[PDB]
Design a binder for this molecule. Sequence first.
Ligand SMILES: [Mg+2]
Ligand SMILES: [Mg+2]
Ligand SMILES: [Mg+2]
Ligand SMILES: [Mg+2]
Lengths: 66, 181, 52, 32, 461, 107, 50, 61, 31
Amino acid sequence: MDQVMQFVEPSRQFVKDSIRLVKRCTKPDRKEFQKIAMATAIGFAIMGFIGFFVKLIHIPINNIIV
Amino acid sequence: VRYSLDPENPTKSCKSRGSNLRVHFKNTRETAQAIKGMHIRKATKYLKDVTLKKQCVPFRRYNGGVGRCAQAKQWGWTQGRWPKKSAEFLLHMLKNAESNAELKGLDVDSLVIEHIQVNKAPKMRRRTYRAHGRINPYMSSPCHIEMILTEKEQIVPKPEEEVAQKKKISQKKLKKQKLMA
Amino acid sequence: NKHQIKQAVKKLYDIDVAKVNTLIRPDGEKKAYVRLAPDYDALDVANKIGII
Amino acid sequence: GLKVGPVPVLVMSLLFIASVFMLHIWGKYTRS
Amino acid sequence: AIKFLEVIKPFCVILPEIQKPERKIQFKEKVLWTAITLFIFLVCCQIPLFGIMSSDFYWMRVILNRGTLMELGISPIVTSGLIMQLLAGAKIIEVGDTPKDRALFNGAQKLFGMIITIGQSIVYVMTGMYGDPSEMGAGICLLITIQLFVAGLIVLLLDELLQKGYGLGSGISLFIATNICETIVWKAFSPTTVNTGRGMEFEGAIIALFHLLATRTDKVRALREAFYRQNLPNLMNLIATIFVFAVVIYFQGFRVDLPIKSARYRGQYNTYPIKLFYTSNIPIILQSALVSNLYVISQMLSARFSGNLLVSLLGTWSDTSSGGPARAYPVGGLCHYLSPPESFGSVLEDPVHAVVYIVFMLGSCAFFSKTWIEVSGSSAKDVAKQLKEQQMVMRGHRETSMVHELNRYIPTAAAFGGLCIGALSVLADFLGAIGSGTGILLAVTIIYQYFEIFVKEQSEV
Amino acid sequence: NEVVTREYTINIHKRIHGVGFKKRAPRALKEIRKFAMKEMGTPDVRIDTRLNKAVWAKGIRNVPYRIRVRLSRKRNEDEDSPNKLYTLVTYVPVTTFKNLQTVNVDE
Amino acid sequence: SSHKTFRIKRFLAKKQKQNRPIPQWIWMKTGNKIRYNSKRRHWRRTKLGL
Amino acid sequence: AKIKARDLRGKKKEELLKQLDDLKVELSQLRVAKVTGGAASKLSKIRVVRKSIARVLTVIN
Amino acid sequence: VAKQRIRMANEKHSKNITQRGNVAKTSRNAP
Ligand SMILES: [Mg+2]
Ligand SMILES: [Mg+2]
Ligand SMILES: [Mg+2]
Ligand SMILES: [Mg+2]
């Protein structure tokens, strides 16, 4: 079946490549996964809060200006 | 680093030196004595003639077996030769010295070769094979060179055909810079 | 030997082997050219092993 | 090419930041 | 070539540049440069522009990046950056391969960013996004240009200083990450309040909980109101963002580690990483463009040719005036099939359409990722040339056989990498997580670099 | 008139007289290159490979006595090169050498 | 020769592996004195004798 | 989860043979990793797994 | 492949004498 396999085979093989690439991928391990998780949270808290305060502080100053 | 002599006015002098250079010591000592006291533009012009065999280096001390030529009469001497590697090596040292003068903001057109000294460097060992299963030394005779340039009141601007030349680009220098970058 | 290599390959990776060719390298190591049965894909098996 | 120092950025930007204030403060307190 | 470098040459010869740090700077000093840098930028955002008079709204100019000194954001400087490596990748511009020319090449990039800013600031003044010039006068228009323009130069100049070793990493990435972060934090703890007929209601999702968990007598009622608003953010939205954050973190570590070594020196083994998100957030941006302007064309086309089945089948359109701007809605046809579902109930009530859009979104993201690599010069051949230029090689391989080894993963990482990028965005939006994958991926990746930098210097810091 | 072309007959017989067999043809090329510099004053002299083939057409020792050449002084497109001009020496096949003068060629 | 005994082909293999330069991190070792592999051999300059 | 000889003293023979086999499978994977570009962590694990193999065989003998 | 191309390509190379310093890297410019 030309027109079937002419599009089925590539898509079917595309899954083959995708599965194969996932097996070869170095996946993060639970201890590595945990190390970053706590890292990102702290880093997230830093930047957001620093920005959160600055946005707050100019609120009254914005009121004075407008 | 210490030089054999000291500049009289260090604020008006530039230095250059090189060590373990693989150019014959004897040819180079003679070549340097020729340009001692020369103005840099004259000195640079002279060494290019030696390469083209239009001016000779008189061999005054190390003259054993050296042939005679009509250009040695310019020096009140019968024996002269045209050591090409000695001239080329000194043209590189002069070029380095001239750049040192620029780095110090000196008038390069007033520089004179005030001091220049050629020293024997440690000798490099090879061997030659002789009759009857004998081996003999085959020694290179490298030299150390050091030159001090000083400003004088005579000015020689650089040749027109020399200042108009392109700043040659070296592909191999570009490669290494890119790799470092 | 070849029989040992063939049996080790099958047990370790649960594949079938057609034949084994062997040479001893100039550095002293022994290299084994293991060919798999036609119903096996060495390219797929390599991904299982981690080679590719 | 023109070169610049790091602090000159901070100083020049700060003066600009100060200059922005004058726009809001003077532009209003003269017209309020 | 000649009329490209020679044109640029004189302009950069005059343009400014920051000096290097001669000897390596200490880490705690780097932080202090970074700390000052982020503070300055934040101030510029909170500052509303001076002179915006007619239309875009004083309240909006008080509250909101809209209307600030950062109206254009970093898009102008970013736009040049993508434009630059696009043309270099596209072969449109001959690469001036020398370090100083390459610095000059970067100089042209800075010029383009400044050019775009004036071009964008001038355009927005013409379009009237701050009012008509005949009303504001040119002098007010000129002030608008200067404020936006100078900000770009300062923002442009600040980022480089951090890049040049005075600080940490890149200021643009720091700012973009922080804005994403402040956006989620703001929605999490904003004390601002909105007057529902029932009274003022806090924007801060976490604030609203206790504010509503204390006020309402029936805590069963507050168990829903704060978490399932539609005109206000919900703690469920914060909940998904947390879940999406964990997912993105897990998939950040995916990569194929290829062993490479220096061709000149023994040992010294290093790894070349092929990140799963090979093409970054570019594929979705390209995916957004085709979605956005396909609607624009299909809307205009049907208006003048509504009688054609060639256009009606392509899409039936409607102008949905739901308060804000009239939101274009694909009534039916292809465009509706190429549009997202808006609610959970809609998704399950029309499963077939959900499948189609989900599938299309993935297919689009994968394709744009695959095609992007060839355009961007990140394919196997390009990567091999980078390694060859850097004197790196695979152990046991020839220079020509490196390309084959990279082709095992690069084309597949592109398609599978793009597909995952789109897929993650769909789930994030289906969960209404704040900022979707694009923001979360950037923020998660960016904090990792600074995290990694800190760890190295944590050795003694 | 930097870009000029003339046609010459080079009496190779008197140029290589007395030269050893294994050096006869090589010295014809050296004398052709020396001749071109004299007539045009350009150290950058380029000898066409067809003229090289004509000088060697009879071997290393039995070199042709006379040879009709053409010299064209052209501008060196290589700005890097220290020589603005250069001479190109091409070959002119002739049936006879009798009464052949030095002739200006107009292009 | 091509005709080789296992014992000879194994002796030659060990002589092949010892013919390499020292690792460059050996230089930074605390009490290091070695500057280079002084036991390098060349197939042409000096012969294995077996 | 490191292997210490004290933990292994009272176990049955077949239980230690199973534990041995898991380590041997682990080492073989690491040796594949050693040539496919495994991280420095996997390379450092080789010596840890090798001495764990020795510990089990020691307690069995 | 025609053997006459050896001659035609050989003669073309000889013409590089007049274009020293600017010789074409590839005469099959397309592609
Ligand atoms: Mg004598
Ligand atoms: Mg004698
Ligand atoms: Mg003998
Ligand atoms: Mg021998």
